[PDB]
Amino acid sequence: DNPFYFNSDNSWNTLFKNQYGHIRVLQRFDQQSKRLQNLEDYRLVEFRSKPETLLLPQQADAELLLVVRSGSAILVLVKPDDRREYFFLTSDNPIFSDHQKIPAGTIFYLVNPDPKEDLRIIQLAMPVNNPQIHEFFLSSTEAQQSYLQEFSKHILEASFNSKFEEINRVLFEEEGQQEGVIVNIDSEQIKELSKHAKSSNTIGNEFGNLTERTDNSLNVLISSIEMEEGALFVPHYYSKAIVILVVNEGEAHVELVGPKGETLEYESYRAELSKDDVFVIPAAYPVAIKATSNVNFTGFGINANNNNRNLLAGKTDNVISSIGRALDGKDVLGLTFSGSGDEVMKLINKQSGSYFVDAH
Amino acid sequence: DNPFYFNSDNSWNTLFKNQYGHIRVLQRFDQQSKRLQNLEDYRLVEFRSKPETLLLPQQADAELLLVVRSGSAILVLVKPDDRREYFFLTSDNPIFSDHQKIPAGTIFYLVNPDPKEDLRIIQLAMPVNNPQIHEFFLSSTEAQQSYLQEFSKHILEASFNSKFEEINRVLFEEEGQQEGVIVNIDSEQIKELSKHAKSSNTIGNEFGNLTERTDNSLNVLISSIEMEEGALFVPHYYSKAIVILVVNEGEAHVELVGPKGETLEYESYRAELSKDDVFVIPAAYPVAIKATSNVNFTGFGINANNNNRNLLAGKTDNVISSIGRALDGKDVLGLTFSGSGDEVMKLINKQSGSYFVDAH
Amino acid sequence: QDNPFYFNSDNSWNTLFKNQYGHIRVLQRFDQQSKRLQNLEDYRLVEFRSKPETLLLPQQADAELLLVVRSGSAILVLVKPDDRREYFFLTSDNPIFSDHQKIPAGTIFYLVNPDPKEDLRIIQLAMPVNNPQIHEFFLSSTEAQQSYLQEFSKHILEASFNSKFEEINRVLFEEEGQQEGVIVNIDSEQIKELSKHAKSSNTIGNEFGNLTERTDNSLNVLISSIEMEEGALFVPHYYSKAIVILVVNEGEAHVELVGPKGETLEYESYRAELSKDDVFVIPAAYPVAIKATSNVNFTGFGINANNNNRNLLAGKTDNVISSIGRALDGKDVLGLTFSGSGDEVMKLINKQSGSYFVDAH
Ligand SMILES: *[C@@H]1O[C@H](CO)[C@@H](O)[C@H](O)[C@H]1NC(C)=O
Ligand SMILES: *[C@@H]1O[C@H](CO)[C@@H](O)[C@H](O)[C@H]1NC(C)=O
Ligand SMILES: *[C@@H]1O[C@H](CO)[C@@H](O)[C@H](O)[C@H]1NC(C)=O
């Protein structure tokens, strides 16, 4: 049992699915292991839809950080005081962004504008009430009942100022209802939206690339890691951030050194990652990742404010060289390892690359 | 059973009670049910006093947010470096405030200076040490010993520089101690205290009124609610604040919608409310309140900074009308409900009311 | 069980490492002792000791540390990945250098005991990031422990270092050349350059005792130091909001804490006889008194300290009871509170001319 590896064949839970797309939530982290109890308050939600579709109005009881891991998207957030907000999200093109935070209980709807590409979304959610994520759909479809349908009849009459039959016909009539929450929209309607919506760094080399961005407000960090077959992300550790990794495409070998099960005895937690798999990396635990195929991930780092990336090989951000460069440093290295301070520095300098190495 | 309902008849517990007043504490929220886990840190204290009384000095291990739900009170804070803070609180006259935060561990005493009216107080507590709330009384009365009496004879003689017998005669002697912590005081005493003390937005209509106040630093809000008999507070929800309702006087019928037991299936949680009953309205969960008689509530909303009030019926703060005014609002609403967008838009317009409605 | 706030050194510390040169101990979890101590689930104490002229090999831990020197001197160096370093000289008593420093989570660091005759005693508060356990990753390869480097695959180490595993093993891990442990002995001459640059980079008390506190506003934690003459008393008092953790550095003391019987209006006295390395917890707003039974010195940490206030129940300074007496109605109020009359109690409160610390022989 590698308690930090979440296989896709078990970890995700289908919430919705139809010919046009699907929604799944990842299982509680702390339920998998108590060693992951500081991740109790965080949950993952994944979404996928075919071209030209619309996700109907809803509001969830969690703070969402929506990331587009493929395609484009039109997001419109609706405010109770007659105000609206539009955002055009695209995973690549440097003109538009690929993430947007959505405040708890804010009604929003999503559109996949492209006629060819699918919208692939991954999001960090942070529930308000208790650790479970609750989505309140306003729609009445074949798949689900609208929440207004839960209140009592005269409460509905007295509110809307109409007779139930009128209110029902216009709102709830089984006839006329759409099938599910992911609906197929028409090309004409969305050109108008897209237009208005549209009006509104990296470290890598031959073998890989790494792009991170930190949201000081949420105290969260968002990465993008691309690696080509045979590449290697040399051993390293993130000082303060807890890192949640997700395979978007590809497969890779992961090696994590954690505590053996409060001692000075280690143990390795090796795993073989593939599409939709999620791997957790605790703050300060060393890790190395090698591309078994071309692979790209998206990661969320929690506790991101003032985090340092410490590398254990290569020319850039190497802490061992740094130790060797302290005032009486070489003497420290010679006592740390079996060689001499000179010998270790010699070895530490053989490698000419930084971050992403070739491992074959 | 409804996990959000706290029946006064069996949810409060008496700390102290005597011919002049009482103090009871509400049971733990997370104990009634795990759904209520993000409330494990808060508590509700209730206290009522007869006219012209004093609550003897004490300090508690919790932050208090005190609220006059009926009557008037003279609150005084005693700081160690020869300082006091005098506050005059009342429920109705717009000249004085109706609430006051009391920092943890601060010595304070209370007075009901009125010669005819009783004092009714409701307060939100945030214990510092663990889930329990601890009150340390300085007083020595027939109902309780002073905490000073838990110290050893030699610690006491040394501290005060007096033989244990002097100390006993002045501070603890049985003959002279009041009967309990609530005390009957004379009108002439509270005369000069009143002077000294006194020198130191609403939405509604004929059917009911709502008055809300947000304490930015505490990130908590207080709501006062009065609805005439037969009035309805139409279906609404709050984006992020989890709400705790308390009935001060009167009767009401409530319906809250939420998750049936992580899915899309809902459930209705209804309840018939009366005095001192408590009801938890989770953030983002739709709710409606129908007044069975003339009723007055007091509410505490926690995790309130930036919370929004989403209404589902009427002229003010209606989300549904706002979705209609979006770019292709009508088309979205069209796909959201059975009716066309023009139809549901016209429907939403029949109710001229806002917030409170006639439902006699 | 009996007294949930007392932690006997004998059965409360677990040894992480120990050898001829020094040792590292970790205190048992606060919550694991008593459910009453719930709000300290995420806090820990680590204790360390060193012989004169010793070095503690590099390591990074997954906890934010607040290091405090309880005796001796130390040179602390923090190593950053961007070719940057931070040097600190720490001492316990001479008012010229600091006695404490905070080490952020995941920062590589190493400590030296420059002194040729004195030991180095450190007490430290830890706030773990991952879960309640505190983990320490040692970079070193010694008879005692292997380096976390040794835990990756040979081929990954080869690709990483661009070296054949035989040379990688030679130069780094060969046991035919490693030290016996993580606390190692050094030469005064070796640290010649270091020490130089290191060295180049609130009290209320009387004849009976001295209190010295400081508050790291960023961390919302308070640091106290108490010294008391044998036979002295820190009269009854309480902290309004801070939860205080007390550690006996040297000496013996008698403590009396007044808490609840288990929400009643019934109190109960929790008492103990403290001595070297015992930890005693003092909850926010719970009354307490300490009688020094031998010359004694304490170091304590105060969590949830921003805005805290000290309330004494006896003495001429910070006396809350006299402060009630001087209120617009005070005397009337004090007369109903206690058995005697307001003038009578007010008379008694003034017999004690001392403040904070009092003679109790
Ligand atoms: C990332 O990797 C590719 C392939 O090695 C390289 O051409 C590219 O310049 C790198 N950086 C960016 C920003 O694409
Ligand atoms: C406020 O609410 C009460 C209760 O329904 C109502 O009777 C009263 O007319 C309202 N009036 C004003 C001025 O707010
Ligand atoms: C502090 O307390 C000590 C120890 O009890 C006392 O002897 C000393 O003189 C006090 N004052 C100063 C300045 O140290």
3-state secondary structure C156-194: HHHHHHCCCHHHHHHHHHCCCCCECCCEEECCCCCCHHH
Structure tokens at A172: 């709830």
Residue that has been written with the tokens 């009723």 in this structure = B295
Against chain A, the chains showing at least 3 CB pairs within 8 Å are: B, C
Size of interface B-C (CB pairs under 8 A): 211
- Asked whether the beta carbons of C38 and C84 are under 8 A apart, the reply is no
- Asked whether the beta carbons of C149 and C157 are under 8 A apart, the reply is yes
The minimum CA-CA distance between A198 and chain C, rounded to whole Å, is 39
Using DSSP's 3-state secondary structure scheme, residue A346 falls into helix
The minimum CA-CA distance between A129 and chain C, rounded to whole Å, is 21
Interchain proximity A326–C83, CB inside 8 Å = no
C28: which chain A residues are within 8 Å (Cβ-Cβ)? Answer: none
Structure tokens at C15: 């040894």
- Asked whether the beta carbons of A262 and C134 are under 8 A apart, the reply is yes
Strand A99-102 versus strand A83-90 pairing type: unpaired
Using DSSP's 3-state secondary structure scheme, residue A190 falls into helix
Measured in angstroms, how far is the CA atom of residue B203 from the centroid of ligand 2?
10
- Asked whether the beta carbons of A87 and A200 are under 8 A apart, the reply is yes
The minimum CA-CA distance between B215 and chain C, rounded to whole Å, is 18
- Beta-carbon contacts of C11 under 8 Å, excluding residues fewer than 6 positions away, are none
Residue that has been written with the tokens 């429907």 in this structure = B347
Helix C342-349, helix C330-337: angle, nearest 10 = 90
Instruction: Please give all residues whose beta carbon lies within 6 A of any atom in ligand 2, as ranges.
Output: B 204, 206-209, 226-228
Options 3.30.420.40, 2.60.120.10, 3.60.20.10, 2.60.40.1730; CATH of B202-360: 2.60.120.10
**Residue nearest to ligand 2 atom 7, measured at CA:** B206
- Asked whether the beta carbons of B121 and B91 are under 8 A apart, the reply is no
Going from N- to C-terminal start, the domains of chain C cover: 8-202, 203-359
d(CA B148, CA C341): 17
**Terminal Cα-to-Cα distance of chain A (whole angstroms):** 29
Of C108, C136, C171, the CB nearest to A344: C171
Interchain proximity B319–A80, CB inside 8 Å = yes
Quote the Cα angle for C39-C43-C47, to 5°: 145
Residue to mutate among A136, A157, A165, A181, with most B CBs inside 10 A, is A136
- Asked whether the beta carbons of B119 and B73 are under 8 A apart, the reply is yes
- Asked whether the beta carbons of C344 and C350 are under 8 A apart, the reply is no
- Asked whether the beta carbons of B273 and B252 are under 8 A apart, the reply is yes
- CB half-sphere exposure, B234, CA atoms < 13 A: 28
DSSP secondary structure letters along A91-104: SS-TTS-SEEEE-T
CB atoms within 10 A of CB A95: 8
Query: Exposed, middle or buried, A260 (CB in 10 Å: 0-12/13-18/19+)?
Result: exposed
- Is C205's C-beta closer than 6 angstroms to any atom of ligand 3? yes
Options 2.60.40.420, 2.40.50.100, 2.60.120.10, 3.60.15.10; CATH of C203-359: 2.60.120.10
**Which has the closest alpha carbon to C263: A234, B15, B54, A18?**
B15
CB atoms within 10 A of CB C180: 13
Structure tokens at B222: 């207080």
Please tell me what DSSP assigns to residue A157: H
Residue that has been written with the tokens 């990794």 in this structure = A245
d(CA C339, CA B142): 10
Residue to mutate among A332, A333, A356, with most C CBs inside 10 A, is A332
B308: which chain A residues are within 8 Å (Cβ-Cβ)? Answer: 79-81, 105-106
**Which has the closest alpha carbon to C212: C120, C314, C118, C92?**
C92
DSSP collapsed to 3 states, A104-143: CCCEEEEEECCCCCCEEEEEEEEECCCCCCCEEECCCCCC
- Asked whether the beta carbons of B296 and B269 are under 8 A apart, the reply is no
Using DSSP's 3-state secondary structure scheme, residue A259 falls into strand
**Which has the closest alpha carbon to B42: B63, B58, B56, B23?**
B63
d(CA C295, CA A269): 51
Options 3.40.50.620, 1.20.1250.20, 2.40.40.20, 2.60.120.10; CATH of A7-201: 2.60.120.10
The minimum CA-CA distance between B66 and chain C, rounded to whole Å, is 18
The helix (run of H) or strand (run of E) holding residue C328 is none
Distances (CA, A) of C169 to A16, A315, A355: 53, 21, 22
DSSP secondary structure letters along C18-71: EETTEEEEEEPPHHHH-GGGGGGTT-EEEEEEE-SSEEEEEEEESEEEEEEEEE
Q: Do domains A7-201 and A202-358 have the same CATH topology?
A: yes
- Asked whether the beta carbons of C210 and C297 are under 8 A apart, the reply is no
Amino acid present at B277: D
- Is C227's C-beta closer than 6 angstroms to any atom of ligand 3? yes
DSSP collapsed to 3 states, chain B: CCCCEECHHHCEEEEEEECCEEEEEECCHHHHCHHHHHHCCCEEEEEEECCCEEEEEEEECEEEEEEEEECEEEEEEEECCCEEEEEEEECCCCCCCCEEEECCCCEEEEEECCCCCCEEEEEEEEECCCCCCCEEECCCECCECCHHHHCCHHHHHHHHCCCHHHHHHHHHCCCCCECCCEEECCCCCHHHHHHHHHCCCEEEECCEEEEEEEECCCCEEEEEEEECCCEEEEEEEECCCEEEEEEEECEEEEEEEEECCCCCCEEEEEEEEECCCEEEECCCCCEEEEECCCEEEEEEEECCCCCCEEECCCCCCEHHHHHHCCCCHHHHHHHHCCCCHHHHHHHHCCCCCECEEECC
DSSP secondary structure letters along C247-293: EEEESEEEEEEEEE----S-EEEEEEEEETT-EEEE-TT--EEEEES
Query: Radius of gyration over alpha carbons of chain B, in Å?
Result: 24
- Asked whether the beta carbons of C55 and C114 are under 8 A apart, the reply is no
Amino acid present at B160: F
**Which has the closest alpha carbon to B289: B300, B302, B301, B273?**
B273
- Asked whether the beta carbons of C286 and C292 are under 8 A apart, the reply is no
Q: Which atom of ligand 1 is nearest the CA belonging to A208?
A: 2
Largest CA distance in chain B: 89
Distances (CA, A) of C249 to A224, C73, C123: 50, 16, 9
d(CA B329, CA C358): 76
**Positive or negative torsion for Cα B342, B343, B344, B349:** positive
**Which has the closest alpha carbon to A26: A219, A253, A279?**
A279
Using DSSP's 3-state secondary structure scheme, residue A219 falls into coil
Q: What's CA C261's distance to the chain center, in Å?
A: 28
**Which has the closest alpha carbon to A150: A134, A183, A172, A180?**
A172
d(CA A228, CA B358): 67
Q: What's CA A187's distance to the chain center, in Å?
A: 29
d(CA C148, CA A46): 35
Amino acid present at B94: P
- Asked whether the beta carbons of C314 and C236 are under 8 A apart, the reply is yes
- Asked whether the beta carbons of A107 and A25 are under 8 A apart, the reply is no
Quote the Cα angle for A55-A58-A59, to 5°: 135
**Which has the closest alpha carbon to A55: A143, A151, A147?**
A143
Q: What's CA C124's distance to the chain center, in Å?
A: 5
CB atoms within 10 A of CB B317: 20
Structure tokens at A176: 């006329």
**Which has the closest alpha carbon to C352: C218, C233, C258, C270?**
C233
Interchain proximity B285–A59, CB inside 8 Å = no
Phi, psi of B82 (to 5 degrees): 55, 50
- Asked whether the beta carbons of A310 and C90 are under 8 A apart, the reply is no
**Residue nearest to ligand 1 atom 5, measured at CA:** A206
**Residue nearest to ligand 3 atom 6, measured at CA:** C207
- Which chain C residue is nearest to residue B54, measuring alpha carbons? C333
d(CA A114, CA A52): 6
Looking at the DSSP assignment, which residues form a beta bridge with residue A302? A220, A242
C176: which chain A residues are within 8 Å (Cβ-Cβ)? Answer: 338
**Residue nearest to ligand 2 atom 1, measured at CA:** B209
Using DSSP's 3-state secondary structure scheme, residue A299 falls into strand
- Is C229's C-beta closer than 6 angstroms to any atom of ligand 3? yes
The minimum CA-CA distance between C114 and chain B, rounded to whole Å, is 41
Query: Radius of gyration over alpha carbons of chain A, in Å?
Result: 24
What is the four-CA torsion angle of B10, B12, B15, B16, rounded to 10 degrees?
-80
* A202-358: in CATH 2.60.40.10: no
CB atoms within 10 A of CB C174: 14
**Residue nearest to ligand 2 atom 3, measured at CA:** B208
CB atoms within 10 A of CB C192: 11
d(CA B103, CA C16): 41
Query: Exposed, middle or buried, C220 (CB in 10 Å: 0-12/13-18/19+)?
Result: middle
B288: which chain A residues are within 8 Å (Cβ-Cβ)? Answer: 151, 155, 159
- Beta-carbon contacts of B195 under 8 Å, excluding residues fewer than 6 positions away, are none
Mutate to test the pocket of ligand 3, among C93, C94, C207 (most ligand atoms within 8 A of CB): C207
Amino acid present at B322: S
Looking at the DSSP assignment, which residues form a beta bridge with residue C22? C19, C50
The beta strand positions in A162-291, using DSSP E, are 182-184, 202-204, 208-215, 220-227, 231-238, 242-249, 251-259, 266-268, 271-274, 278-281, 287-291
At the second CATH level, the architecture of C8-202 is Sandwich (2.60)
- Asked whether the beta carbons of B344 and A169 are under 8 A apart, the reply is no
